[PDB]
Amino acid sequence: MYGLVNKAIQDMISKHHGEDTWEAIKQKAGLEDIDFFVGMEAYSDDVTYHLVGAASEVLGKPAEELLIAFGEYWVTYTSEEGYGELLASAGDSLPEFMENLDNLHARVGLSFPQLRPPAFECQHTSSKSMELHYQSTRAGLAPMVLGLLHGLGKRFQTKVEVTQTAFRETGEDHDIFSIKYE
Amino acid sequence: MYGLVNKAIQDMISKHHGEDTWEAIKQKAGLEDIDFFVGMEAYSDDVTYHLVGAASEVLGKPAEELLIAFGEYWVTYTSEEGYGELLASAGDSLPEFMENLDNLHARVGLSFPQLRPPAFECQHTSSKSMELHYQSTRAGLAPMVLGLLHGLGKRFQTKVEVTQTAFRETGEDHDIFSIKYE
Numbered sequence: 494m495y496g497l498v499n500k501a502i503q504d505m506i507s508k509h510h511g512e513d514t515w516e517a518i519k520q521k522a523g524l525e526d527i528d529f530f531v532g533m534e535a536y537s538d539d540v541t542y543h544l545v546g547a548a549s550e551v552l553g554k555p556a557e558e559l560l561i562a563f564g565e566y567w568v569t570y571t572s573e574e575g576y577g578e579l580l581a582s583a584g585d586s587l588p589e590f591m592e593n594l595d596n597l598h599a600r601v602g603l604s605f606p607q608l609r610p611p612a613f614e615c616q617h618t619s620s621k622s623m624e625l626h627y628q629s630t631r632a633g634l635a636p637m638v639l640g641l642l643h644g645l646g647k648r649f650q651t652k653v654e655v656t657q658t659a660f661r662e663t664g665e666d667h668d669i670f671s672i673k674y675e
Numbered sequence: 676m677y678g679l680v681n682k683a684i685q686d687m688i689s690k691h692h693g694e695d696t697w698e699a700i701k702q703k704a705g706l707e708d709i710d711f712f713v714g715m716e717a718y719s720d721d722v723t724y725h726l727v728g729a730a731s732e733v734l735g736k737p738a739e740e741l742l743i744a745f746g747e748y749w750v751t752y753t754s755e756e757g758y759g760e761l762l763a764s765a766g767d768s769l770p771e772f773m774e775n776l777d778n779l780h781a782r783v784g785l786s787f788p789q790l791r792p793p794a795f796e797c798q799h800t801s802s803k804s805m806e807l808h809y810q811s812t813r814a815g816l817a818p819m820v821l822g823l824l825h826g827l828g829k830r831f832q833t834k835v836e837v838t839q840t841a842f843r844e845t846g847e848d849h850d851i852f853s854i855k856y857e
């Protein structure tokens with residue numbers, strides 16, 4: 494993935510758990526010789542997976558838990574590190590934002606040519622609920638999607654309840670989320 | 676399962692969709708010949724499963740979402756229908772409630788002698804997170820647990836973020852959930 498993602502991981506853990514802890518994760522992940530991640534360069538997905546693993550072993554939290562936290566963190570990070578205008582343009586409510594999400598990533602992909610973005614489709618089942626379908630080239634990011642949804646809930650001062658109802662990991666076609674909102 | 680569970684399914688579907696909707700579901704489950712469920716009497720699990728599957732078909736929604744909504748409904752149902760004191764005694768917080776859940780189900784077991792309760796163990800990864808291990812004699816109730824946890828979220832005015840990280844339905848030992856909370 495693009496170094497932006499790894500910068501953001503680094504950023505979250507350094508603020509929440511300090512630099513000594515990050516140094517350890519950096520060491521344990523096998524990236525002692527990398528001074529900094531370059532935001533607009535594309536790294537192997539391995540680098541992100543080894544960071545999450547090393548972070549899980551250092552922090553003693555399951556990877557999937559850190560994915561939830563990093564999903565939420567990513568909504569604040571992107572607003573503050575040069576994509577706040579783009580975020581705001583994607584909508585004024587949780588449901589409008591999710592409808593616009595493929596569009597946002599298309600806009601991102603102009604400037605990030607090696608982007609493998611996620612594919613999102615919304616089924617609106619009421620004015621307070623929807624089914625969100627998530628398709629990806631990558632596995633195991635469903636917990637991150639859950640965190641992102643809660644961050645968008647906080648962003649739009651909106652109560653939100655998310656439950657994953659279909660699991661690629663369990664042999665369904667693709668990840669599906671049932672979402673309820675104010 | 677004990678009749679209380681099927682009473683609550685009936686009570687949920689009746690309250691949100693009307694008795695004709697329920698009467699349709701009742702019929703297609705093969706349970707035309709049951710006037711009412713006896714709460715403190717044990718039934719075959721078959722009954723609940725047919726009720727879920729019939730209710731899925733009649734309402735036009737996946738069985739998972741019905742288990743999720745029912746899981747939430749149960750926390751409200753138990754408070755009203757004779758187990759509010761017991762609910763209250765089991766805790767002042769979400770993480771405390773889950774630690775007391777096996778003891779709650781043992782207390783229930785005094786009065787319901789053929790209870791096959793769930794087993795829940797908490798591994799607290801921080802003051803705001805846990806790994807919840809759910810063990811059961813039955814398959815397929817994982818979605819209901821998400822619902823239950825959302826009900827407990829509302830009971831205690833607590834924001835809850837849940838992904839399931841391991842699946843009893845596959846070669847893994849039992850269902851695990853990663854949870855973050857206020």
Ligand code: HEM
Pocket residue numbers: 494495497498571572576577579580594597601605607608609610611612628629630631634637638641642
């Ligand atoms: C300004 C806002 C955003 C920017 C600039 C952005 C950019 C990106 C970038 C660069 C990646 C890495 C893809 C790669 O390296 O191939 C990515 C991945 C992802 N983004 Fe965003 N994103 C934004 C907002 C969102 C939001 C709000 C969500 C909410 C669900 C979202 C969901 C994802 C997901 C799920 C992935 C993982 C890709 C996959 O499944 O394969 N993004 N995004």
Ligand code: HEM
Pocket residue numbers: 676677679680750753754758761762776783787789790791792793810811812813816820823824
């Ligand atoms: C407060 C009062 C409660 C009562 C009286 C109660 C009682 C019961 C009863 C009677 C059953 C059916 C088991 C059988 O028929 O063999 C059951 C099952 C179950 N209860 Fe509760 N319960 C309560 C609260 C909770 C809560 C708060 C949760 C939250 C997670 C929970 C989780 C479950 C689960 C998962 C099952 C399914 C059993 C299985 O996995 O095999 N219960 N409970």
